[PDB]
Amino acid sequence: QSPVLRIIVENLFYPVTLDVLHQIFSKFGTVLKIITFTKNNQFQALLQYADPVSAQHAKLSLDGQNIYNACCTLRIDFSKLTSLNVKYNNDKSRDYTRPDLPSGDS
Amino acid sequence: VSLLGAPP
Structure with a gap:
């Protein structure tokens, strides 16, 4: 899991x-890190919880739901990644456990 | 209908 x-x-x-x-x-749980990106003309993201059960719960509850009325449908699956590596805190990535990260390449 | 309703 x-x-x-x-x-x-x-x-x-x-x-x-x-x-x-x-x-x-x-x-559904404590979100530690998030990274977003656009690939194959689709908005995607990787999100790391502290607890695998939280991830399971969020998938069960949120999969297929619209974020706002009439749009933005969540399609959720499990990643094989055991954790995420975030280098910067900005509009595209965030490590909620590391407030000292720069916002972009030095 | 949605998680957050109308956009912010």
């Missing part, structure tokens, strides 16, 4: 920020 979730937000008809993902997923 991996504590890391792979997320895809489909029907992105309104922007979804990293902070909004933190808000939604924090209802």
Whole structure:
């Protein structure tokens, strides 16, 4: 059981920020890190909980749900990654346990 | 209908 979730937000008809993902997923556990990126013309993210059960719970409860009315559908699966490596704290990535990270390459 | 309703 991996504590890391792979997320895809489909029907992105309104922007979804990293902070909004933190808000939604924090209802099921302690979110340690999040990284977002765009690949294959799809908005994706990796999110790490401290507890694998929290990840399981969030997947069961949130998969297929729309973040906002009529858009932004969550497609959630488990990642094989055991943890996440975050280098910066900015609009695309965040390590909630490391407040000293720079916002971009030095 | 959705988790957060209308956008911020």
